[PDB]
Coordinates of C-alpha atoms and ligand atoms in Angstrom, one line a residue:
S1 CA -153.6 -125.9 -6.8
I2 CA -156.6 -127.7 -8.3
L3 CA -155.4 -131.0 -6.9
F4 CA -154.7 -129.4 -3.5
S5 CA -158.2 -127.9 -3.3
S6 CA -159.9 -131.3 -4.0
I7 CA -157.8 -133.2 -1.4
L8 CA -158.2 -130.6 1.3
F9 CA -162.0 -130.4 0.7
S10 CA -162.3 -134.2 0.9
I11 CA -160.3 -134.3 4.1
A12 CA -162.5 -131.6 5.6
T13 CA -165.6 -133.5 4.7
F14 CA -164.3 -136.7 6.2
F15 CA -163.4 -135.0 9.5
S16 CA -166.8 -133.3 9.5
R17 CA -168.3 -136.7 9.5
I18 CA -165.9 -137.9 12.2
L19 CA -166.3 -135.0 14.6
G20 CA -169.9 -135.6 15.7
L21 CA -169.0 -139.2 16.6
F22 CA -165.9 -138.1 18.5
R23 CA -167.9 -135.5 20.4
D24 CA -170.4 -138.1 21.5
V25 CA -167.6 -140.4 22.5
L26 CA -166.2 -137.7 24.7
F27 CA -169.6 -136.9 26.2
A28 CA -170.0 -140.6 27.0
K29 CA -166.5 -140.6 28.7
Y30 CA -166.8 -137.3 30.5
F31 CA -170.5 -137.3 31.5
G32 CA -172.0 -140.7 30.6
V33 CA -175.8 -140.7 31.1
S34 CA -177.1 -138.2 33.7
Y35 CA -179.6 -135.5 34.5
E36 CA -176.7 -133.0 33.8
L37 CA -176.4 -134.1 30.2
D38 CA -180.2 -134.1 29.8
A39 CA -180.3 -130.5 31.0
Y40 CA -177.5 -129.7 28.5
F41 CA -179.5 -131.2 25.6
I42 CA -182.7 -129.4 26.7
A43 CA -180.7 -126.1 26.8
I44 CA -179.2 -126.6 23.3
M45 CA -182.3 -128.1 21.7
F46 CA -184.1 -124.9 20.6
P47 CA -181.0 -123.3 18.9
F48 CA -180.0 -126.7 17.4
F49 CA -183.6 -127.1 16.1
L50 CA -183.4 -123.7 14.5
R51 CA -180.0 -124.4 12.9
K52 CA -181.3 -127.7 11.6
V53 CA -184.3 -125.9 10.0
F54 CA -182.1 -123.3 8.4
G55 CA -179.7 -125.9 7.1
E56 CA -182.5 -127.5 5.2
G57 CA -183.0 -124.2 3.4
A58 CA -185.8 -122.6 5.4
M59 CA -184.0 -119.2 5.1
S60 CA -182.6 -119.6 1.6
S61 CA -185.8 -120.8 0.0
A62 CA -187.5 -117.4 0.7
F63 CA -184.5 -115.1 1.0
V64 CA -182.7 -116.0 -2.3
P65 CA -185.5 -115.2 -4.8
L66 CA -186.6 -112.0 -3.0
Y67 CA -183.0 -110.9 -2.7
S68 CA -182.2 -111.6 -6.3
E69 CA -185.2 -109.8 -7.7
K70 CA -183.9 -106.6 -6.1
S71 CA -181.1 -104.3 -7.2
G72 CA -178.8 -101.6 -6.0
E73 CA -179.4 -100.1 -2.6
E74 CA -182.8 -101.7 -2.3
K75 CA -181.1 -105.1 -2.2
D76 CA -179.1 -104.1 0.9
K77 CA -182.2 -102.6 2.4
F78 CA -184.0 -105.9 1.9
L79 CA -181.1 -107.7 3.6
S80 CA -181.1 -105.1 6.4
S81 CA -184.8 -105.6 6.8
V82 CA -184.4 -109.3 7.2
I83 CA -181.6 -108.8 9.7
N84 CA -183.5 -106.2 11.7
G85 CA -186.9 -107.9 11.8
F86 CA -185.5 -111.3 12.9
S87 CA -183.1 -109.6 15.4
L88 CA -186.1 -107.9 16.9
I89 CA -187.9 -111.2 17.2
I90 CA -184.9 -112.9 18.5
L91 CA -184.4 -110.1 21.1
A92 CA -188.0 -110.6 22.3
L93 CA -187.4 -114.3 22.1
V94 CA -184.4 -114.0 24.4
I95 CA -186.0 -111.6 26.8
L96 CA -189.0 -113.7 27.3
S97 CA -186.7 -116.7 27.6
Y98 CA -184.9 -115.1 30.5
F99 CA -188.2 -114.2 32.3
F100 CA -190.2 -117.4 31.4
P101 CA -187.6 -120.1 31.0
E102 CA -190.3 -122.8 31.7
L103 CA -191.8 -121.9 28.4
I104 CA -188.7 -123.0 26.5
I105 CA -188.0 -125.9 28.9
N106 CA -191.4 -127.5 28.7
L107 CA -191.1 -127.7 24.9
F108 CA -188.2 -130.2 25.1
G109 CA -188.0 -131.6 28.7
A110 CA -191.4 -131.0 30.2
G111 CA -191.3 -134.3 32.2
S112 CA -187.7 -134.0 33.5
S113 CA -186.8 -133.8 37.1
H114 CA -186.6 -130.6 39.2
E115 CA -182.8 -130.5 39.3
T116 CA -182.7 -131.1 35.6
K117 CA -185.0 -128.1 34.9
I118 CA -183.1 -125.8 37.3
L119 CA -179.8 -126.7 35.5
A120 CA -181.4 -126.3 32.1
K121 CA -182.7 -122.9 33.1
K122 CA -179.2 -122.0 34.0
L123 CA -177.8 -123.3 30.7
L124 CA -180.4 -121.4 28.7
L125 CA -178.8 -118.2 29.8
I126 CA -175.8 -119.3 27.7
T127 CA -177.5 -121.0 24.8
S128 CA -180.3 -118.5 24.1
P129 CA -177.9 -115.8 22.7
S130 CA -176.5 -118.4 20.2
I131 CA -179.9 -118.1 18.3
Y132 CA -178.9 -114.6 17.2
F133 CA -175.6 -115.8 15.7
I134 CA -177.4 -118.8 14.2
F135 CA -179.8 -116.5 12.3
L136 CA -177.0 -114.3 11.1
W137 CA -175.1 -117.4 10.0
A138 CA -178.1 -118.6 8.1
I139 CA -178.6 -115.2 6.4
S140 CA -174.9 -115.1 5.4
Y141 CA -175.3 -118.6 4.1
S142 CA -178.1 -117.6 1.8
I143 CA -176.2 -114.5 0.4
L144 CA -173.4 -116.9 -0.4
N145 CA -176.0 -119.2 -2.1
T146 CA -176.5 -116.4 -4.7
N147 CA -172.7 -116.3 -5.3
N148 CA -172.3 -120.1 -5.5
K149 CA -174.7 -123.0 -5.1
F150 CA -173.4 -124.6 -1.9
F151 CA -169.7 -124.8 -1.3
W152 CA -167.9 -124.8 2.1
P153 CA -170.6 -123.3 4.4
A154 CA -171.9 -126.9 4.6
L155 CA -168.7 -127.6 6.6
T156 CA -169.0 -124.5 8.8
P157 CA -171.0 -126.4 11.5
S158 CA -167.9 -128.5 12.1
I159 CA -166.6 -125.3 13.9
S160 CA -169.3 -125.8 16.5
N161 CA -168.3 -129.4 17.2
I162 CA -164.7 -128.4 17.8
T163 CA -165.5 -125.9 20.4
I164 CA -168.0 -128.2 22.2
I165 CA -165.3 -130.9 22.1
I166 CA -162.8 -128.5 23.6
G167 CA -165.4 -127.6 26.3
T168 CA -165.8 -131.2 27.1
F169 CA -162.1 -131.6 27.7
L170 CA -162.3 -128.6 30.1
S171 CA -165.4 -130.0 31.9
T172 CA -163.2 -131.8 34.5
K173 CA -162.5 -128.3 35.7
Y174 CA -166.0 -126.7 35.3
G175 CA -168.6 -129.3 34.5
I176 CA -171.4 -129.2 32.0
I177 CA -171.2 -125.4 31.7
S178 CA -168.0 -125.8 29.8
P179 CA -169.6 -127.7 26.9
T180 CA -172.5 -125.3 27.0
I181 CA -170.1 -122.3 26.6
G182 CA -168.4 -124.3 23.9
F183 CA -171.8 -124.5 22.1
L184 CA -172.3 -120.7 22.3
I185 CA -168.8 -119.8 21.2
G186 CA -169.1 -122.3 18.3
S187 CA -172.2 -120.5 17.1
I188 CA -170.5 -117.2 17.2
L189 CA -167.5 -118.5 15.3
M190 CA -169.7 -120.1 12.6
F191 CA -171.2 -116.7 12.0
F192 CA -167.7 -115.1 11.9
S193 CA -166.5 -117.8 9.5
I194 CA -169.1 -116.7 6.8
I195 CA -169.6 -113.1 8.0
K196 CA -168.0 -111.6 4.9
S197 CA -171.2 -112.0 2.8
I198 CA -173.2 -109.6 5.0
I199 CA -170.4 -107.3 6.2
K200 CA -169.8 -106.1 2.6
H201 CA -173.4 -104.6 2.5
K202 CA -174.5 -101.2 3.7
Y203 CA -176.7 -101.3 6.8
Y204 CA -180.0 -99.4 6.7
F205 CA -182.1 -98.8 9.8
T206 CA -185.3 -100.2 8.3
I207 CA -187.7 -103.1 8.3
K208 CA -189.1 -102.0 5.0
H209 CA -189.3 -105.4 3.3
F210 CA -189.8 -107.6 6.4
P211 CA -193.6 -108.1 6.4
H212 CA -193.6 -109.3 2.8
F213 CA -190.6 -111.5 3.5
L214 CA -192.5 -113.1 6.4
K215 CA -195.5 -113.6 4.1
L216 CA -193.2 -115.7 1.8
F217 CA -191.1 -117.2 4.6
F218 CA -193.7 -118.6 7.0
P219 CA -195.2 -121.4 4.8
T220 CA -191.9 -122.9 3.9
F221 CA -190.6 -122.4 7.5
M222 CA -193.5 -124.4 8.9
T223 CA -193.1 -127.2 6.3
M224 CA -189.5 -127.5 7.6
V225 CA -190.6 -127.3 11.2
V226 CA -193.0 -130.2 10.7
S227 CA -190.2 -132.1 8.8
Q228 CA -187.8 -131.6 11.8
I229 CA -190.2 -131.8 14.7
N230 CA -190.0 -135.5 15.4
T231 CA -186.8 -135.2 17.4
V232 CA -188.4 -132.5 19.7
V233 CA -191.5 -134.7 20.3
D234 CA -189.4 -137.8 21.0
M235 CA -187.3 -135.8 23.5
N236 CA -190.2 -134.2 25.3
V237 CA -192.0 -137.6 25.5
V238 CA -189.0 -139.5 27.0
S239 CA -188.4 -136.6 29.4
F240 CA -191.2 -138.1 31.5
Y241 CA -189.3 -141.4 32.0
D242 CA -186.3 -141.9 34.2
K243 CA -183.3 -139.5 34.2
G244 CA -180.9 -139.9 31.3
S245 CA -183.6 -140.9 28.8
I246 CA -182.8 -137.9 26.6
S247 CA -179.1 -138.7 26.7
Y248 CA -179.8 -142.3 25.8
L249 CA -181.8 -141.2 22.7
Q250 CA -178.9 -138.9 21.7
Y251 CA -176.3 -141.6 22.1
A252 CA -178.2 -144.2 20.0
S253 CA -179.0 -141.5 17.5
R254 CA -175.3 -141.0 16.7
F255 CA -174.9 -144.5 15.3
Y256 CA -178.2 -144.3 13.5
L257 CA -177.1 -141.0 12.0
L258 CA -173.7 -142.0 10.7
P259 CA -174.9 -144.5 8.0
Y260 CA -178.0 -142.3 7.4
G261 CA -175.9 -139.3 6.6
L262 CA -173.4 -141.3 4.5
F263 CA -175.7 -143.6 2.5
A264 CA -179.1 -141.8 2.5
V265 CA -178.4 -138.1 2.7
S266 CA -175.6 -138.0 0.1
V267 CA -177.6 -140.0 -2.4
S268 CA -180.4 -137.4 -1.8
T269 CA -178.1 -134.5 -2.5
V270 CA -177.0 -136.1 -5.7
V271 CA -180.5 -136.9 -6.9
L272 CA -181.7 -133.3 -6.1
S273 CA -179.0 -131.8 -8.3
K274 CA -179.4 -134.4 -11.0
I275 CA -183.2 -134.1 -11.4
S276 CA -183.0 -130.3 -11.1
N277 CA -180.5 -130.3 -13.9
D278 CA -182.3 -133.1 -15.9
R279 CA -186.0 -132.8 -15.1
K280 CA -187.4 -134.8 -18.0
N281 CA -185.6 -138.0 -16.8
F282 CA -187.1 -137.7 -13.3
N283 CA -188.0 -141.4 -13.1
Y284 CA -184.6 -142.6 -14.2
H285 CA -182.7 -140.5 -11.7
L286 CA -185.0 -141.4 -8.9
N287 CA -184.7 -145.1 -9.6
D288 CA -180.9 -144.8 -9.6
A289 CA -180.9 -143.0 -6.3
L290 CA -183.3 -145.5 -4.7
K291 CA -181.2 -148.4 -5.8
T292 CA -178.1 -146.9 -4.4
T293 CA -179.7 -146.1 -1.0
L294 CA -181.1 -149.7 -0.8
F295 CA -177.8 -151.1 -1.7
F296 CA -176.1 -149.6 1.3
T297 CA -178.9 -149.1 4.0
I298 CA -180.3 -152.6 4.0
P299 CA -177.1 -154.5 4.8
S300 CA -176.0 -151.7 7.2
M301 CA -179.2 -152.1 9.1
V302 CA -178.7 -155.8 9.3
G303 CA -175.1 -155.5 10.5
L304 CA -175.9 -152.7 12.9
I305 CA -178.7 -154.6 14.5
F306 CA -176.6 -157.8 14.9
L307 CA -173.5 -156.0 16.2
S308 CA -175.2 -153.1 18.1
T309 CA -173.9 -154.1 21.6
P310 CA -170.2 -154.6 20.7
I311 CA -170.3 -151.4 18.6
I312 CA -171.8 -149.4 21.4
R313 CA -169.5 -150.9 24.0
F314 CA -166.5 -150.2 21.8
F315 CA -167.3 -146.6 21.2
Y316 CA -169.0 -145.5 24.4
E317 CA -168.3 -147.8 27.3
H318 CA -165.4 -145.7 28.7
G319 CA -165.1 -143.4 31.7
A320 CA -168.6 -142.4 32.9
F321 CA -170.4 -144.5 30.3
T322 CA -171.2 -147.8 32.1
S323 CA -172.2 -151.3 31.0
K324 CA -175.8 -150.5 32.0
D325 CA -175.7 -147.6 29.6
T326 CA -174.3 -150.0 27.0
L327 CA -177.2 -152.4 27.4
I328 CA -179.9 -149.7 27.1
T329 CA -178.2 -147.7 24.3
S330 CA -177.8 -151.0 22.3
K331 CA -181.6 -151.7 22.5
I332 CA -182.4 -148.1 21.5
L333 CA -180.0 -148.3 18.6
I334 CA -181.7 -151.5 17.3
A335 CA -185.1 -149.8 17.5
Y336 CA -183.9 -146.7 15.6
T337 CA -182.0 -148.9 13.1
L338 CA -185.0 -150.8 12.0
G339 CA -186.1 -147.6 10.3
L340 CA -182.9 -146.7 8.4
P341 CA -183.7 -148.1 4.9
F342 CA -187.2 -146.6 5.0
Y343 CA -185.9 -143.1 5.9
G344 CA -183.3 -143.5 3.2
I345 CA -186.0 -144.1 0.6
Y346 CA -188.0 -141.3 2.2
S347 CA -185.2 -138.7 1.9
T348 CA -184.5 -139.7 -1.8
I349 CA -188.2 -139.4 -2.8
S350 CA -188.7 -136.1 -0.9
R351 CA -185.7 -134.4 -2.5
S352 CA -186.7 -135.6 -5.9
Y353 CA -190.1 -134.0 -5.4
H354 CA -188.3 -130.8 -4.2
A355 CA -186.1 -131.1 -7.3
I356 CA -189.3 -130.6 -9.4
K357 CA -190.7 -127.9 -7.1
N358 CA -193.4 -130.1 -5.5
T359 CA -193.6 -129.1 -1.8
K360 CA -197.2 -130.4 -1.2
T361 CA -196.4 -134.1 -1.4
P362 CA -193.3 -134.0 0.8
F363 CA -195.2 -131.9 3.3
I364 CA -198.1 -134.4 3.4
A365 CA -195.6 -137.2 3.9
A366 CA -193.9 -135.3 6.7
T367 CA -197.3 -134.6 8.3
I368 CA -198.1 -138.3 8.2
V369 CA -194.7 -139.2 9.7
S370 CA -195.0 -136.7 12.5
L371 CA -198.5 -137.5 13.5
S372 CA -197.7 -141.3 13.4
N373 CA -194.6 -140.6 15.4
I374 CA -196.4 -138.7 18.2
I375 CA -199.2 -141.3 18.4
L376 CA -196.8 -144.2 18.6
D377 CA -194.6 -142.2 20.9
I378 CA -197.4 -142.1 23.4
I379 CA -198.4 -145.7 23.0
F380 CA -195.1 -147.5 22.7
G381 CA -193.4 -145.0 25.1
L382 CA -195.8 -145.9 27.8
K383 CA -195.2 -149.6 27.2
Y384 CA -191.4 -149.7 26.6
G385 CA -190.0 -146.2 27.5
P386 CA -187.2 -144.8 25.3
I387 CA -187.0 -148.0 23.2
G388 CA -190.7 -147.5 22.4
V389 CA -190.0 -144.0 21.2
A390 CA -187.2 -145.0 18.9
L391 CA -189.3 -147.9 17.5
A392 CA -192.2 -145.4 17.0
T393 CA -189.8 -143.3 15.0
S394 CA -188.9 -146.3 12.7
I395 CA -192.6 -147.3 12.2
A396 CA -193.6 -143.8 11.4
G397 CA -190.9 -143.7 8.8
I398 CA -192.3 -146.9 7.3
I399 CA -195.8 -145.3 7.0
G400 CA -194.4 -142.2 5.4
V401 CA -192.5 -144.2 2.8
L402 CA -195.6 -146.2 2.0
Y403 CA -197.4 -142.9 1.3
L404 CA -194.5 -141.6 -0.8
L405 CA -194.1 -144.8 -2.8
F406 CA -197.8 -144.9 -3.6
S407 CA -197.6 -141.3 -4.7
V408 CA -194.4 -141.4 -6.8
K409 CA -195.4 -144.8 -8.3
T410 CA -191.9 -146.0 -9.1
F411 CA -189.6 -148.5 -7.3
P412 CA -186.8 -151.0 -8.2
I413 CA -188.4 -154.1 -6.8
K414 CA -186.0 -156.6 -8.4
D415 CA -183.0 -154.8 -7.0
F416 CA -184.8 -154.6 -3.6
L417 CA -185.2 -158.4 -3.6
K418 CA -181.6 -159.0 -4.7
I419 CA -180.3 -156.7 -2.0
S420 CA -182.5 -158.3 0.7
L421 CA -181.3 -161.8 -0.3
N422 CA -177.7 -160.7 -0.1
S423 CA -178.3 -159.1 3.3
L424 CA -179.9 -162.3 4.7
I425 CA -177.0 -164.4 3.3
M426 CA -174.6 -162.0 5.0
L427 CA -176.5 -162.2 8.2
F428 CA -176.4 -166.0 8.1
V429 CA -172.6 -166.0 7.7
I430 CA -171.9 -163.5 10.4
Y431 CA -174.3 -165.4 12.7
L432 CA -172.0 -168.4 12.1
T433 CA -169.0 -166.4 13.0
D434 CA -170.5 -165.3 16.4
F435 CA -168.9 -168.0 18.6
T436 CA -166.4 -166.0 20.7
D437 CA -166.8 -163.3 23.3
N438 CA -164.2 -160.7 22.5
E439 CA -164.5 -156.9 22.6
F440 CA -162.9 -156.5 19.1
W441 CA -164.4 -159.6 17.4
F442 CA -167.1 -157.4 15.9
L443 CA -164.6 -155.7 13.6
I444 CA -163.7 -158.9 11.9
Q445 CA -167.4 -159.7 11.8
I446 CA -167.9 -156.4 10.0
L447 CA -165.2 -157.4 7.5
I448 CA -166.7 -160.9 6.9
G449 CA -170.2 -159.4 6.4
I450 CA -168.9 -156.9 3.9
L451 CA -167.0 -159.6 2.0
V452 CA -170.0 -162.0 1.8
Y453 CA -172.3 -159.2 0.8
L454 CA -169.9 -158.0 -2.0
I455 CA -169.3 -161.5 -3.2
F456 CA -173.0 -162.2 -3.7
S457 CA -173.6 -158.7 -5.1
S458 CA -170.9 -159.5 -7.7
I459 CA -172.6 -162.8 -8.4
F460 CA -176.1 -161.4 -8.9
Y461 CA -175.0 -158.2 -10.7
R462 CA -172.5 -159.9 -13.0
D463 CA -174.0 -158.6 -16.3
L464 CA -174.1 -155.0 -14.9
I465 CA -170.5 -155.3 -13.7
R466 CA -169.3 -156.6 -17.1
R467 CA -171.2 -153.8 -18.9
Ligands
LIG1 C1 -163.2 -141.1 16.9 C2 -163.9 -142.5 16.8 C3 -163.1 -143.5 17.8 C4 -163.3 -143.0 19.2 C5 -163.0 -143.8 20.2 C6 -162.5 -145.2 20.0 C7 -162.5 -145.9 21.4 C8 -161.5 -147.1 21.3 C9 -161.7 -147.9 22.5 C10 -160.8 -149.2 22.4 C11 -161.1 -150.1 23.6 C12 -160.4 -149.7 24.9 C13 -161.0 -150.4 26.0 O1 -160.7 -150.0 27.3 O2 -161.8 -151.3 25.9
LIG2 C1 -181.8 -104.6 17.0 C2 -183.2 -104.2 16.5 C3 -183.1 -103.1 15.5 C4 -184.4 -102.9 14.8 C5 -184.3 -101.8 13.7 C6 -185.6 -101.5 13.1 C7 -185.5 -100.4 12.0 C8 -186.8 -99.6 12.0 O1 -187.4 -99.4 13.0 O2 -187.3 -99.1 10.8 C9 -188.5 -98.4 10.9 C10 -188.7 -97.4 9.8 O3 -188.0 -97.9 8.7 C11 -188.1 -96.0 10.2
LIG3 C1 -205.5 -146.5 11.3 C2 -204.8 -146.2 9.9 C3 -204.9 -144.7 9.6 C4 -204.0 -144.1 8.8 C5 -202.7 -144.9 8.4 C6 -201.8 -143.9 7.7 C7 -202.1 -143.7 6.2 C8 -202.0 -142.2 5.8 C9 -202.2 -142.1 4.3 C10 -202.7 -140.6 4.1 C11 -202.7 -140.4 2.6 C12 -203.2 -138.9 2.3 O1 -203.6 -138.3 3.2 O2 -203.2 -138.4 1.0 C13 -203.7 -137.1 0.8 C14 -203.1 -136.4 -0.4 O3 -204.1 -135.6 -0.9 C15 -202.7 -137.4 -1.5 O4 -201.6 -136.8 -2.2
LIG4 NA1 -190.4 -141.6 18.1

């Protein structure tokens, strides 16, 4: 029982990590880089952006306290208010979307070609309704958060991936609309997966509590918008360059995002819970988290940059994804990957501040990062295209972390220097091993790099290991 629960949950988490990668592999094989996939991304970008905002707690942060302070029927009324109000908004937001699709389109792919915008308009007819099920999924999620802190809903998004993957398999019959339908159905099934939390409540035909809830919800919602806006800006900027730019950024983003989610984000969740449970030792916990992030993100970066082309070719260069796409996506991946350690630090510091209820400093950091990213998007995007946009993302990350480090005034410098030294030693060794051109050699280079890095980590952290 107890053992079963743990092993099943761990399997589900592992597969959750794998499914995004597999979906992008299938996109590469079945669509490659094309205006069609660009239009798909434009069509799914607004609902995806909203789900990303709500997953960071934009809904929970305002809903949970206002919901908990209420009692009896009023509680349900509050819930109903939230459901009704947003539904109304969403309804308007869908109706307008049907009549003025250019409004939605120009937010994410203003510069894309005519055929791309026509196809994206077509796909919005399928993706716009998913916003409704995404909002309801979010609300359900919050209600659960009163019952238990986090739990499985974190894995409910996996549902979406499965359906999209299924759609991709069927695309040989129908084309891009099959993955788009897959996206919509996935949204609906997410909502159904956690629907129990709302379906147990009585429905009231009211928006009694909605204005007050908006008064408390809008500030936090906008902070999260700013914190998540960089991807929208990057997408809309590169939309002005040749077709497939959006798709290139997505493909490179996958391999940026695996190590980021595994090394940075997880450390950040741990530190948030730790500091929230043990506030008075803020510094200690923060330092610990920082060290951990640096221990994994610096070598990863090095490795990923050195092996970016064989990695991209191994995972993507099949079917519709060509060697040209490999070249371009490799360069973009390098540009993104220069920023990995900085965004790791950034995430850790931001969530520590959140752990002590400081929203101002994280919001200022996010503002610096987004402003920097748009400025550098214009400049470097004009000079270098998509690669310039990715590089702008990395540099903006650096600036943000400089602000956060000066603000929090704590950092494990000694461990940073040790980790950097080990990473350069590792790089030297794998450079020596790069003497043969084989499509699978990079896997043994990964093993060699890991071994060297761990050897020198065990040398330089011998006292810690012993104790
Ligand atoms: C899920 C993550 C792995 C997905 C695809 C691996 C692709 C393996 C490609 C092996 C090389 C085949 C080739 O044709 O080269
Ligand atoms: C779907 C939109 C349903 C919107 C329901 C709004 C409820 C309402 O109009 O309440 C007004 C007042 O409480 C009486
Ligand atoms: C040309 C260089 C201009 C800006 C570089 C970016 C530096 C951005 C640093 C901004 C720091 C800041 O704005 O701090 C305000 C806040 O009150 C403190 O907590
Ligand atoms: Na950028």
